[model samples]
Target chain A: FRQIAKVPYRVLDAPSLADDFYYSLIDWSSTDVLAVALGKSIFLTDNNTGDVVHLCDTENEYTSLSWIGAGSHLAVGQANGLVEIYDVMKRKCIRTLSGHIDRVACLSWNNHVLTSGSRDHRILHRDVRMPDPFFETIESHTQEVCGLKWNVADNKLASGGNDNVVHVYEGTSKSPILTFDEHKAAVKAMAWSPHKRGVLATGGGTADRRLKIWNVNTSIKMSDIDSGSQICNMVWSKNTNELVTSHGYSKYNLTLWDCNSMDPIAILKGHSFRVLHLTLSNDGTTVVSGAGDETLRYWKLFDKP
Target chain B: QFMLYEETAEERNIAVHRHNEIYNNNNSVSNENNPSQVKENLSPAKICPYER
Candidate 1:
């Protein structure tokens, strides 16, 4: 990996440990706040300063996070098969949703509802206004569901997991409208393109360390970027068509790829451990990464090249 | 021998009488407080010998 600025990336600000091992990071656009899941605690940070404020501490490890609209509500998935909705303003847990028997691996939220995928090979759709489940689907993959993505339109959802398959579900149906079996390994992370409609990307899992992009409308694979390591987490630039993937282990690097050609545009190195999670700013100018090194590193991307 | 017997019996009788008095005194104190009231207000008695 080429040294962009320094080994630790001088472009990034001072690093702070989010948790023992960070698993997921998300930016709440409505509030300009960033949320990170590390071990059993979710850290809410001020995006401007990188200062962390603990949101909700749990007994089980938190695997994924998502913010519900502009409100104070946030959803978190845990290893103990529980999905919790927290009211940040009240500093209280509003609900504990139970469906998956194993780890609740990933979660996503739209304005109306929240969705959760689990290791038990099930995806649960929960309405924000109701206590009971709106819809439950066991039709995705045969293994643990590691990643979830709600379309920018909020009309559909994409799920992928250890079974090495991607399933796109329409509305609240149990059967998927489309399924893609392109990767050789499990689908560990996924993100929907903010710039283009019906475009999505997924990375990490088992043996396949490549990034695969798809058109959700037609359910077809468009292009693949070979990262050479398990691409554990990914996010699309909010302003542009660039995709950021956190790749590698033991020595992790963040690579930027152009969405059209699926070519690696820029490669960032310096993480001493596996890069487990990452997210981009609402403007897509800054990227924050959390890794097994027990630190969250912030990067500022430049438009000039 | 007679004198020794008398003294031993007297001492034994006195000891038995003192033991009964102590038992009665404890019973009277317990009776003064309702058993349910004592149980509600007092900490649970330790059953095991192991130190916590």
Candidate 2:
């Protein structure tokens, strides 16, 4: 509702959710499609007009969604351990990838490959050209896998799970290039810096309640950014070297940090409940955060007057 | 409500064993060759925190 620079956000529209728990949402500009994952349905909207389009109405809840191949297709991870690829133009399920035994929690895709993690404690790598997954790595975690992210170059992948460990794995291989164990609790969200190649950030509910940055190549904990509340979502700025982290269990505590100094630059306050998801624009200048408060807010970063 | 499922000790051991096997095998292969000389032929890079 309110922005950091005092730029007013006009509420374009508010769409009703089929279920109270909405898990994932993504926007594919190449196709101009916006997708939202509710409990048992996938909702698509016009990115410009916000017109609703019911893409998939299924019995199972989807835990994650990713845009693949320049918006030609999308991959959805469901509670039944199924990863299905849907064509945006055709609006049809084109492929089903099954490798995990439990619920698929997170997924990411590149030009030719798709990667996913699940509650089964496994990560599966599949060639987008084929329907069946060619390689799968078990033991990525001792518990359920919670987060998965692919780098912008599409060659590397990172995973965080219930074990409180973060593992950076080479594409399609079972071995991890780097691993960090600083988090004392499960890592709920992990994101790669959009501007730098070896920078990664993770935030979650630990006994300490903080966010940690890692030097991916050396596998070292570079710095830790603290938020007094349970940190649920952390997103990197697109243009600037900054991070946006949302606190769980409370509304009105969104903290932005300097990427290099790991210092709090701004603290945004407004939501009424736990912040669930946060996203930045392609350029990282605009930010949008969704929450259990049943509201979504937009923020723009600008130079201080 | 979010539920946490605990894995049995036996299941945990099996998963750990499998994970070790895969990791050791991959490392052995990479170590056998010069990584920089054959970096392209090596496995894809791991996702770092920053854009790479």
Report the lDDT tens digits of candidate 1 across residue range A131-151. 454455565677667778788
Q: Report the lDDT tens digits of candidate 2 across residue range A137-250.
A: 657687777778888573678888777778887776788888887877667677888787888888855344668888787667788866666666668776677788876543
Which residues of candidate 1, in runs, are more than 4 Å off? Answer: A1-22, A25-29, A48-51, A302-305, B1-52
lDDT of each: 0.65, 0.64
Instruction: Report the lDDT of model 2 for residue A165.
Output: 79
DockQ of 1: 0.01
DockQ score of the complex predicted as candidate 2: 0.02
lDDT per residue as tens, model 1, B1-52: 0010112345445543553454344322235544321121121232122457
User: Candidate 2 residues B1-36, lDDT tens each?
Assistant: 111122345644554455445434432122554332
